[PDB]
Amino acid sequence: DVPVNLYRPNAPFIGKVISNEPLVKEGGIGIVQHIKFDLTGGNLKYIEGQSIGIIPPGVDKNGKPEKDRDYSIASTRHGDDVDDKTISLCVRQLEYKHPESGETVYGVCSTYLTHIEPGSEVKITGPVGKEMLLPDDPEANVIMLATGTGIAPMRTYLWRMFKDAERAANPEYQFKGFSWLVFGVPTTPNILYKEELEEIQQKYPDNFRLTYAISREQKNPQGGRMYIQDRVAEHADQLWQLIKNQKTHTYICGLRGMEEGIDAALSAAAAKEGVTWSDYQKDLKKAGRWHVETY
Ligand SMILES: Cc1cc2nc3c(=O)[nH]c(=O)nc-3n(C[C@H](O)[C@H](O)[C@H](O)COP(=O)(O)OP(=O)(O)OC[C@H]3O[C@@H](n4cnc5c(N)ncnc54)[C@H](O)[C@@H]3O)c2cc1C
């Protein structure tokens, strides 16, 4: 049922860039781009929570062809125009230290993508992944814990749940549960898709809650910068009470490092009721109700 590896590295789909828009507003940190690709002329299909590969041009420092890099799909199965013709990505330009030889180092595939022009052809593989799928059950509770580009699979969920055109296109999924996104970014200009998330919470106050952790604008109770683990700690009891429901799913996505603090906070909440979270969590994972994609 789930589409997987309709295209592979040895024979990728050659798509075309339709658009490449900035998601970091003025005064933000770094570069994050929303990139939409044209799927017509191939049979790439996908669903929410999946990823695709991009193969960038060029050779590495050893003269070898650059390999596939994976990116979370940021559009629903229908694409952003709900026409089943496109796919979108949410791509950060990787750049970093002199402690790697040079000045700023720029990631190969992410710089290629963030600066790519409409009309350009791109090698696309996939889709891949079965561990970040949304339940078919419209009454499920969905907790979403995202930092940075980890917003990508959450966008596919929330758009399927809450976009008018999606609801009209998806007879069998009329979401009536409760979802709660905790989203960590450094600044308010760095809140990817801010306007549309806040629009969704406004329209569906009983079905969507939005919580920000903004490190350059907020301090945790210990006086440090506010991170997502701080917000999960602040709301640990609320989150644990939701997690106790047999129909609750939790999704974690972002750059690696968030999980440790999320676990310590939930562990303290569950312990009050004589539950060891690490054991409860293994069971959730086994049941397919604890989903993690970090990188
Ligand atoms: C399942 C999955 C989904 C992903 N989804 C997304 C997504 O939606 N959006 C997105 O932007 N990315 C996503 N990523 C990461 C993405 O695949 C690429 O790793 C990333 O874009 C960087 O690739 P590059 O080609 O730009 O960098 P490369 O040129 O491949 O450079 C990467 C290398 O630089 C180093 N490095 C990384 N960060 C630092 C740092 N600050 N300090 C020091 N060295 C560093 C390491 O050596 C790393 O191997 C995802 C990864 C996976 C596995």
UniProtKB/Swiss-Prot annotation:
Q: Binding positions for FAD?
A: 69-72, 90-92, 96, 108-110, 149
Q: Name one GO cellular component term.
A: plasma membrane-derived thylakoid membrane
Q: What is its EC number?
A: 1.18.1.2
What are the UniProt keywords, alphabetically? Antenna complex, FAD, Flavoprotein, Membrane, NADP, Oxidoreductase, Phycobilisome, Thylakoid
Q: Can you tell which superkingdom this protein's organism belongs to?
A: Bacteria
The catalytic activity, as recorded, is: 2 reduced [2Fe-2S]-[ferredoxin] + NADP(+) + H(+) = 2 oxidized [2Fe-2S]-[ferredoxin] + NADPH
**Keyword Lyase among record annotations:** no
As for membrane topology, the entry says: Peripheral membrane protein
Where is it mainly found? Answer: membrane
Q: Where in the cell is it found?
A: Cellular thylakoid membrane
Enzyme superclass (EC) = oxidoreductase
Does this UniProt record's set of keywords contain Membrane?
Answer: yes
Molecular function via GO: ferredoxin-NADP+ reductase activity; flavin adenine dinucleotide binding; NADP binding
**Residue stretches making up the FAD-binding FR-type domain:** 10-134
Describe the family membership recorded for this protein in Swiss-Prot or TrEMBL: Belongs to the ferredoxin--NADP reductase type 1 family.
By what name is this protein known? Ferredoxin--NADP reductase
Read off the lineage from the record. Answer: Bacteria, Bacillati, Cyanobacteriota, Cyanophyceae, Nostocales
